Nucleic acid binder design. Structure first.
Lengths: 317, 21, 292
DNA sequence: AAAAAAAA
DNA sequence: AAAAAAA
């Protein structure tokens, strides 16, 4: 019915949150995924201190966390999430011990432990995808103070190191910057800043985002772009009968990833660093178009020239 | 506020939407 | 009557893959060449360990590879290649012992060992040529993650160290960068990103790519260029009656080895050289746009 | 827009 | 084309 990743995530969230876990609210799913990511990364109080190569200042924080009492049953998480009395059992059983590595588990040969670590990794990936989606969603109506220039905007979202390790191709920030600056191996993955991520209520169900889905504009945009992406992407939405709050998806952007406009010098030709800008001198960016694939067919839509955040702000006034 | 428009889906980045012209 | 270079490759492919080796499929030939290249470089499981100057991590990796079970008869290598029982004998008798150097072989005077080393080197060259062609073919539709600017695109293809050691004039990447960005000797080869490499199905039989032979658009483009080259090169191919993804070569570019968009390339046609105006868009972008 | 590797 | 020779 569901892949291993989504089944693992559903089982984990159910076990940890009882009946308080709403399966149709994006905010609740995002909060649950964030809590689970903290639990599986040993960031919660009362978990193993990270000391392997930590500096004394970091060791202070880790020791303080270890000494601090762990979360108690019934504790409020986010808005509408309540911890069950059995969350400690799940944390003790399903969370690999600090420093666990897949090679050691495989060498042990325990199928149960191998499956436990596989579930842990899949849960980390799912939680980090939900984290990136929530980052885009927040950025749709809340500019990040850190982003001031296109160089800063180039590395969105600014998520922690664990997020990058789980999803290197979706997570940006300091670690993505380091990876791009540093040596690039065969395993290097570039930051796909506008990769399509289904809304959390869809991601956990395994339903792939496509045409016709009953979604809201903000959640669709957070799926296919973020705040500072161009506003023409709003063309991928259409209000339903009676307006209301939830509309429908009429199409999806093309060229979501893998856009290269280089033309190397060959056969006596001269290199081009960017096909779009080369032209003849007409650097009019407002004439650019995006290919939106709809049910009927692909249509080229003229760019709006304005950020998605600004378009949403103007339409909300 | 911020008036940046990052390059996405084949579009070119804009350092400021207002100045464009 | 094929040259020894191709004869050795055909014999090795036969001995190692039985009848599963199809000599008409570019993907199958590329997979067979890749397997042979990793066999002759001592990269397969159970082979000797590269522990002459390995670091701790590399030492451990090589030791694990040596301890790991070697491929066995019937293993699936790719999609349509199955190892035979003779592959162990071939790997034992034809692959030179790890670290062997041609100087010592020639000094010893053993004719058999000399022939084995010469065949090994020729096979490495053939396999690396096939590897470069396949890299171009892959890049025709899916660009490398490392290629972000022209400075990065200048070192395509990004192949391994042994690949560069075998064909320095065709292979790029980190070792080509190191050679170019450093002291250069008289025996120094310049990377030719557009050197003409016949498709493997033609390479292994000695057929030289020429006007009038049936090929596919992606095949010809990978033969004469790669993904980020200008799209005007597509004019070197022409579909046949009904297309069917199979056409014919109508020309081959020269100099392979407002005004900016008015630059022209030289194409050698059956009649003569003609100047064709550039398209301005890389082959990758043109293929993406023309896909539908 | 599968799996195996794997911290300022 | 012959010769030479790993992060």
């Amino acid at each position: 019915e569901l892949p291993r990743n989504l089944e693992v995530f559903n089982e984990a969230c159910g076990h940890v949150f009882g009946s308080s876990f709403n399966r149709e609210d994006n905010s609740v799913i995002s909060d649950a995924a964030a809590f689970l990511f903290k639990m599986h990364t040993h960031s919660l109080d009362g978990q193993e201190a990270k000391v392997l190569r930590a500096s004394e200042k970091k060791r202070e924080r880790e020791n303080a966390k270890k000494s601090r009492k762990a979360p108690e049953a019934g504790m409020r998480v986010g808005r509408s999430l309540i911890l069950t009395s059995r969350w400690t059992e799940y944390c003790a059983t399903c969370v690999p011990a600090l420093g666990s590595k897949m090679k050691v588990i495989k060498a042990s040969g325990d199928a149960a432990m191998i499956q436990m670590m596989k579930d842990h990794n899949s849960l980390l990936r799912v939680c980090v995808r939900i984290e990136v989606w929530k980052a885009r969603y927040v950025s749709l109506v809340a500019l990040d103070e850190r982003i001031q220039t296109l160089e800063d905007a180039q590395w969105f979202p600014y998520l922690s190191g664990d997020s990058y390790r789980a999803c290197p191709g979706l997570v940006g920030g300091y670690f993505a910057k380091k990876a791009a600056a540093g040596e690039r191996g065969k395993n290097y993955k570039k930051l796909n800043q506008t990769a399509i991520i289904p809304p959390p209520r869809f991601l956990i169900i395994g339903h792939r985002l496509q045409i016709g889905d009953q979604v809201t504009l903000r959640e669709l945009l957070a799926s296919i772009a973020w705040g500072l992406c161009d506003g023409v992407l709003a063309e991928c939405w259409s209000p339903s009968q009676g307006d209301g709050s939830i509309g429908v998806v009429v199409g999806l952007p093309l060229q979501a990833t893998g856009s290269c406009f280089l033309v190397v010098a060959s056969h006596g030709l001269s290199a081009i660093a960017d096909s779009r800008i080369e032209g003849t001198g007409n650097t009019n960016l407002l004439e650019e178009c995006i290919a939106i694939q709809k049910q009927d067919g692909v249509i080229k839509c003229k760019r709006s020239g304005k950020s998605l955040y600004h378009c949403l702000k103007e339409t909300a006034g | 506020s911020c008036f940046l428009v990052v390059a996405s889906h084949g579009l070119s980045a804009i350092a400021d939407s207002r100045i464009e012209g």
